[model samples]
Target: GDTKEQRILRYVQQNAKPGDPQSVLEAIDTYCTQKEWAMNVGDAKGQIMDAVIREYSPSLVLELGAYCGYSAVRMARLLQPGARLLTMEINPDCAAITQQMLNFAGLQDKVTILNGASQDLIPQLKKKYDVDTLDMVFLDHWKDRYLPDTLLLEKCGLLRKGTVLLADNVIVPGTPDFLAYVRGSSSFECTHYSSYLEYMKVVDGLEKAIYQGPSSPDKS
Candidate 1:
């Protein structure tokens, strides 16, 4: 009877490796090619994210979750000249391994791997990148914090006009409050892109490709 969060907490903890990146991605890809981890974009979803980046042509990009840097590489490959990708991973070891892989893929110069969570690291970003003016943002980690973190960014004034936000696992791990926040905000507009939930056909969901803009800088 008292198992509401006990089970979920166990699952979350089991998956949490303080700084370990596992380097399990490539192995996972090789073995279960079709059933890719639902976190990173598969071939098909990669195409979509790539296409979106190409269209947006953002020179400065930030990815909330950098899992082994797969999507970071994908973003790097599609970036325009002088473009840079800043990806954050709560696991420093994951950031470390991902950087190694990114370097191996010739993306070391193009991508920067940061170790921290979005909300906690937002201030550091403010000091480092002056991130109150990000061009692109990817909400890819810790499903539950999406909305809260977005609000934190908003309040901090990092999301500027014409900012493009790409979120994954929206249909599977899904962030209902985050999606609802976007839909309800007058300052932001969103487009739902259809995407599969990765492994099984038993579940399905859409990616909320949020495009917010025509925004005037915070008029305080």
Candidate 2:
């Protein structure tokens, strides 16, 4: 009844107007800024997410993490009709909260909450979900998963040319291996946004890596 995510949901239901996505976001953002520190990809990183969403107008999307649906709601509300965002949350409790929260914001139709780990579910997207290639992908899951899952997506053929793969937290509690793979490989055209951690003063940032195509054949 008094958990961090539970409280966050209650606050959104009360403080935010029914069916208003922005209102829900404000409630969560304000609460996190003043009350708690969640891994919700707060407004700072959200702005980057916002920009990328606007820039691409992605329809079929994948998000590695769906913590409380904060970023999910953020991306979904900005999406056009016929667009869908599939977000994953390994924690079933948080997945429940995210589903409720999305309904509260009336964004339930815009986002689908997948209650499982990314590794297991990602491989099934092709045949099970009929998803051929993704338009955009936002990775905010486990720091360890960012790299393996990226490679997995390629192996699964879910990434087409020009797909945007925006990843959060490359600096604080960072993903060094992921950074190396995405940046070092010619398959991705990379850019880094210098920024700060959510609800904190520490330095952190988002890595925007655009899929260019298959990696070049390894040099002998």
Candidate 3:
């Protein structure tokens, strides 16, 4: 019996053409749905992410979870030539496989994979990248960490006016607290797009939110 990671690599080798991100993504999607279950954002929600990337053309993008490099590859293809996406993966196994997948897709230069806890890594981003703000953040990790990480981004002064936060799996594996915080805060304007869970027809949603800037008058 082969591991899922090995199977993914094998599938890519057999089906996806080297240096072709689109082919690699298609191969991965097919393998995940037909061969085994993968935690990628999937094709359904992936289009939404692509649209956001195209709209912002963000120079600095942060990804909270990178399960198999599926979403990373998808987002990397749409990023501006000099733009970069820094992704954090807590699982060593997934991180390793994700790196290989990204390389296969010829997107190594477009992304930097940080294999560690988001809490430890999020704060280091400011100094590591020599940047004060992230133009976009894609949250797709543990449901509970969403709000805490968002707060961490704020506390670290990484979020500012016009920063966009796109969160996946907001409804299916419901993030009640996160939704409440985003919707209730005067600092953000949030909207939900109803959709289905990746690889399934179950009800789910994606949240598109923009930071309203600290300069905005305090709602209190």
Candidate 4:
């Protein structure tokens, strides 16, 4: 017996198998309607992200939390052909499910899921996607690690001039420390986008922090 939130997560995740994009989307829609109590950055929010991607026209993107692969798919759809999205999900289960859904959506070649905590994976990805090489990054994992992870990514050579880093659940989960970090640093020119939390009327909020560089270098 799972709690309501737990059940909601499970229910939404249930339709995330290795095929059938429509079914996966159907499950996402069903979960959105019935649960109405999630912050998985649902379809509507995904559109907002897509709008940003379209405006920026990033050729390579990275996502910190690949929950169910919604954002990855959204980014993939918006990015130019041959663009890649490398997502790092701490939870292996979620990573597998996200991969399945991506494959189902015919987006497997566009987005690849790495199984590991982003804190652990970012360093490894540095060699693969250097600062100038990466175009976009999304933060939807542990709220506390948001700032640290961004800093780490920079150190790992992931964010360069014009590289965008979008963060979610900033208000409800409250990434005050992370916000303060961005505000205090000159290395990153940050901008914030405010949005209502997905599937909820409780006034939760999300934030997209774009890291515009050539401002400073705090990294080694």
Off by over 4 Å in 4: 1-27, 35-39, 128-132, 198-200, 214-220
Kindly list the per-residue Cα lDDT of model 1 for residues 108-186, writing each as its tens digit: 8888888987888876787876554778887778999788878877777778867888777676767888888787876
Candidate 1: where are CA atoms >4 Å away?
1-38, 130-132, 202-220
Model 3: which residue pairs collide?
A: none
Name the candidate, 2 or 4, with the larger TM-score value. 2
Evaluated against the true structure, the overall lDDT of model 1 is 0.68
What residue runs in model 3 are displaced by over 4 Å at the alpha carbon?
A: 215-220
> Which candidate comes out best when scored by TM-score?
2
The residue pairs that clash in candidate 4, if any, are 131-157
| TM-score for candidate 2 | 0.96
lDDT of model 4, residue 116: 93
- Pairs of residues at least 3 apart in sequence or in different chains that clash in candidate 2: none
Alpha-carbon shift of residue 77 in model 3 (angstroms): 0.6
The estimated TM-scores of all candidates read 0.78, 0.96, 0.94, 0.80
Candidate 2's residue-wise lDDT over 1-220, tens digit each?
4799999999898899989999999999998888887875478788888999999999999998898989999999999999999989999999999999999999898888899999999999988877989999999999999999999999999999999999988888899999999999989999999777633669988999999999676697
Q: State the lDDT at 4 in candidate 1.
A: 20
By lDDT, the better pick of 3 and 4 is 3
> Backbone clashes per model, in order?
2, 0, 0, 1
Local distance difference test scores for all models: 0.68, 0.91, 0.89, 0.71
Give the worst 10-residue stretch by lDDT in candidate 4: 1-10
Per-candidate Cα RMSD to the true structure, in Å, reads: 8.0, 1.6, 2.0, 4.3
